[PDB]
């Protein structure tokens, strides 16, 4: 059945949104970390 495929697509897009929301908080922390580390 394709209802299972629809459910899997729904959960995949939900997971993508959730991980993007997780990233958005510490995006700047990661940017600052790499900017500090690359410089001598």
């Amino acid at each position: 059945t394709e209802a299972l495929l629809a459910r899997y697509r729904e959960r995949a897009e939900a997971e993508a949104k959730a991980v993007r929301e997780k990233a958005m908080a510490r995006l700047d922390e990661a940017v600052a970390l790499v900017l500090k580390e690359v410089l001598p």
Binding site: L4, L5, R7, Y8, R9, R11, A12, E13, E15, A16, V19, R20, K22, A23, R26, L27, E29, A30, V31, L33, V34, L35, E37, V38, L39, P40
Partner: protein, 128 residues
């Protein structure tokens, strides 16, 4: 039954890849503003010292015209010639004595050289 699992895995992995590429774009656009910063002469002094310590018996130093004024003292102190080169940006170049070897200390090269090493820490900070 397994196509859905593959879809979920691909979506998660591509979202993570997008996040890391956004981080890389941000750090790339952050690095290019350093010459405006007043700390830039110290950065170029450090880069030139690193390049010359990485090239024993170096002949000359090659840099951007707008960044060589910050490096006039070091060349005379180290006993090497300094040259002008508009193509080189936000970094320094030292040409070996024989003329065959040379070194580079541009920041973008360092960034792309250390991005693989820092990617794990980036992921840990973002989602760990």
């Amino acid at each position: 039954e397994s196509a859905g699992e593959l879809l979920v895995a691909t979506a998660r992995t591509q979202a993570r890849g997008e996040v890391l590429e956004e981080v890389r774009r941000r750090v790339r656009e952050a690095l290019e503003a350093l010459p405006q910063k007043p700390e830039w002469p110290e950065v170029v002094r450090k880069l030139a010292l690193e390049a010359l310590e990485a090239l024993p018996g170096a002949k000359a130093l090659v840099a951007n015209p707008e960044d060589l004024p910050h490096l006039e003292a070091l060349a005379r102190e180290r006993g090497v010639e300094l040259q002008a080169e508009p193509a080189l940006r936000l970094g320094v170049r030292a040409v070996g004595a024989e003329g065959k070897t040379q070194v580079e200390n541009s920041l973008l090269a360092r960034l792309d050289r250390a991005w693989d090493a820092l990617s794990s820490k980036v992921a840990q900070a973002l989602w760990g």
